[PDB]
Design a protein around this nucleic acid. Structure first.
Lengths: 52, 115, 25, 136, 52, 49, 209
RNA sequence: AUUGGAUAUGCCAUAUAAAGCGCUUUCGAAGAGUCGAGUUGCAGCUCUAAAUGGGUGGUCAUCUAA
RNA sequence: AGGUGGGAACGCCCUUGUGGCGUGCACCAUCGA
RNA sequence: UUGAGAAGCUCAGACGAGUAGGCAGGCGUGGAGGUUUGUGACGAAGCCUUGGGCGUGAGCCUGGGUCGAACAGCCUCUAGU
């Protein structure tokens, strides 16, 4: 915690080092799609692989 | 006709070794003598301070170190630089006066004939 | 992780006392 | 353009989220958020903390509760002295922008936390940055 | 970032666990990039290349 | 006529005089604003420490 | 001195520290919110680390019945800190773990309805619901904090009337049981949270006014 | 086994001496067929200096060649 | 750090939509400097 | 109904010469890091074959004979490919 520090706090064994952050806040993207935030608003689904 | 830098890790260590072999003989005394603080001469850099060559003949007289006992205790002298203003002189007395305050010269045995 | 010319040409800094006892030796 | 030119596997994830949100909803927001993540780095220019604070808070200063959304980098402007209570949502925040919003203001979001706050993208502003380098 | 185990059980030289723990260092929440490392490690592995 | 031929260089030397302290003040006001931009502490991550 | 044992990696140590919290929490004094926000970061992980489906659904009830152990003054403080700490870090979960943090929410929303029933025999319920409603007005259903996610309130509408009926099988009297959900859909700036909240709610207007 | 600079110690030394810095009613020597000018391909040829002088740079600053 | 037209998107609509109504990013015209 | 390597799966139409040129995906060779709880004196590599197998193709896998110490697949790096 003194070599890499934190994401908002300087690593003590490195001048001007801050740990990077992420382009996605939750590291798991197939578990937002299935949340209650998304599946309440979405339009009525179609079927799977369609019949011929 | 090139200049290849494959020895660059090696001159670093060779310098590092020869800087440790310098210290072997001088084990209790520094590997380099104290240099003054002199201001660079251009309009660009005249607000900076950096190490120079040596202490003048009147920076050194005013601190209590004669020009002959100077280079024994490791104090470079510059017989060319002169103190134009007090500020050039008051800054560098406090280089010597701290150096003499922090330095301990080991004594020596003399050659007085007896009987 | 670790936690004005009259007074300078006359007065000197102190003896700079010794630590770790070998520079005191 | 159908797949991002990058190999950032934290950005295959966003595209895997907004190309789901593009086709299961009726918003053209998600068909515009997705239509920007494919664009290269020179096509998503930065936008400062002052141009964002100027865009929302002007004319009538309608800045009630809308989240500014840029698919780029929220950089800083230091000629802006006081920062208003803003709320942004971008991929990258520079470390002097993220500390000049939170010091007196609101929320800094990734497009993940946007999709759990405005899943259909209502009450937002969808800004860009200036593409113009004036010679390059 | 999202959420991880807060304390790690610190072991002993005999194989048994010890009561004392330690916080999870903030580095373990950093991005996992199988792409950036391939670009740096590619470039750092060619730094002890003797010429020919 | 303006200034003499060789004394025009002062305006070419003058920029240099600023150019050391140009970057020098911008290396310290940079850090001053990088001193005051410290993110608060959030006494929630410290409990497990 | 106590919380960092609740986040141990041994269930024989996590639970062994939980029953001693029953002694620590029933004290008759005043507790400050952050002290209940640091303690609620241990019981989050005491429940975040929960292995079996026949243990975590027993651990939830042991967390649910922890509320009547709280002193009367800070009993409403203790739930307010939970709904904050169950809305501050609800995005950090995955689907293989939300299923168990829904029932903790279901119990605590129901554990509130049980405590109003207990408090209704001491003083009239019309004020008891209001200060409980106040706790709802600075926790989840506050409007100005946009960060409180939707997945909490969508699940908080579905379990609102059904575990009102569960704790009140005979007949629940008229009060402001739905006033949180009316002031929410009226002015909250989460557009879907005012649109699809009525489509999820099962409000019962026959007994309310 | 050869060799280093040291440390302590023994004997010698010749000191009627030598050195640092005050203080001066005193003195303070400074490199030539070189410098320099003219002129042919830094060299050649013709000519040939001075002592606050001579050199190189902006009346000043800075240096003390042969 | 100028208004006026477009124009990405997003609200409120009630002619469901249409259309109205408000905020209008980049980029482009228009008159300001 | 399980067909979520979402870089996968699936439905439907049209189209198919190609020069200079432009774009894309792959095959193979020598070395380098990682990997196969990798193969090998009960026979590795090579070589030969009126044997079999795969791929549109560059190529690869294999049976038999010969032979006698090393060698390959996968993900990357590299070029005297």
């Amino acid at each position: 915690d003194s070599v890499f520090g934190s994401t908002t706090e300087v690593a003590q064994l490195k001048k001007n080092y801050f740990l990077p952050e992420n382009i996605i806040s939750n590291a798991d993207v197939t578990r937002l799609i299935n949340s209650d935030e998304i599946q309440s608003i979405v339009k009525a689904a179609g079927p799977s692989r369609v019949k011929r | 006709y090139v200049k290849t830098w494959f020895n660059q890790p090696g001159r670093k260590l060779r310098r590092r070794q020869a800087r440790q072999t310098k210290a072997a003989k001088i084990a209790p005394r520094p590997v380099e003598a104290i240099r003054p603080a002199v201001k660079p001469p251009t309009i660009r850099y005249n607000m900076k301070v950096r190490a120079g060559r040596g202490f003048t003949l009147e920076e050194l007289k005013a601190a209590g170190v004669s020009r002959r006992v100077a280079s024994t205790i490791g104090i470079p002298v510059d017989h060319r630089r002169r103190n134009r203003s007090e500020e050039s002189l008051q800054r560098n007395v406090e280089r010597i006066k701290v150096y003499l305050a922090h330095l301990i010269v080991f004594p020596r045995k003399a050659g007085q004939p007896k009987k | 992780p670790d936690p004005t010319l009259d007074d300078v040409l006359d007065k000197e800094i102190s003896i700079a006392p010794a630590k770790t006892e070998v520079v005191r030796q | 353009r159908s797949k991002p030119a990058s190999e950032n596997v934290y950005l295959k994830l966003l595209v895997k989220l907004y190309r789901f949100l593009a086709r299961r909803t009726d918003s053209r927001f998600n068909k515009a958020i997705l239509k920007r993540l494919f664009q290269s780095k020179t096509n998503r220019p930065p936008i400062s903390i002052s141009k964002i604070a100027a865009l929302t808070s002007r004319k009538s200063a309608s800045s009630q509760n809308k989240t500014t959304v840029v698919v780029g980098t929220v950089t800083d402007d230091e000629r802006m002295l006081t920062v208003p209570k803003l709320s942004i949502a971008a991929l990258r925040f520079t470390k002097s922008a993220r500390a000049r919003i939170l010091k007196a203001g609101g929320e800094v979001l990734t497009l993940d936390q946007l999709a759990l706050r405005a899943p259909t993208g209502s009450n937002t502003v969808l800004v860009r940055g200036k593409k113009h380098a004036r010679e390059a | 970032m999202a959420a991880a185990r807060p304390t790690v059980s610190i072991y002993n030289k005999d194989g048994s666990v010890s009561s004392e723990t330690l916080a999870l260092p903030f580095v373990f929440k950093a991005p996992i990039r199988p792409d950036l490392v391939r670009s740096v490690h590619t470039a750092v592995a060619k730094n002890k290349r003797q010429p020919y | 006529t303006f200034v003499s031929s060789t004394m025009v260089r002062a305006a070419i030397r003058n920029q240099a005089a600023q150019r050391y302290v140009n970057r020098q003040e911008s290396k310290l006001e940079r850090q001053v604003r990088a001193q005051q931009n410290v993110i608060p502490e959030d006494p929630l991550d410290n409990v497990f420490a | 001195p106590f919380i960092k044992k609740l986040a141990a990696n041994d269930r024989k140590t996590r639970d062994k520290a939980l029953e001693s919290l029953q002694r620590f929490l029933s004290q008759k004094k005043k507790f400050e919110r952050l002290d209940f926000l640091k303690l609620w970061k241990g019981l989050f992980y005491c429940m975040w680390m929960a292995d079996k489906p026949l243990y975590q659904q027993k651990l939830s009830d042991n967390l649910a019945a922890l509320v009547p152990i709280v002193w009367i003054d800070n009993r409403i403080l203790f739930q307010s800190t939970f709904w904050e700490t169950m809305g501050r870090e609800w995005t950090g979960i995955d689907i293989l773990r939300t299923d168990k943090f829904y029932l903790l929410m279901r119990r605590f929303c129901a554990a509130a309805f049980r405590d109003i029933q207990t408090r209704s025999k001491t003083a009239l319920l019309d004020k008891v619901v209001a200060e409980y409603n106040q706790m709802w007005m600075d926790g989840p259903f506050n409007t100005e904090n946009l960060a409180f996610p939707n997945g909490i309130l969508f699940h908080l509408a579905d379990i609102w009337t059904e575990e009102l009926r569960k704790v009140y099988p005979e007949d629940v009297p008229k009060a402001d049981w739905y006033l949180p959900f009316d002031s929410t859909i009226k002015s909250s700036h989460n557009v879907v949270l005012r649109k699809t909240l009525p489509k999820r709610l099962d409000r019962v207007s026959e007994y309310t006014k």
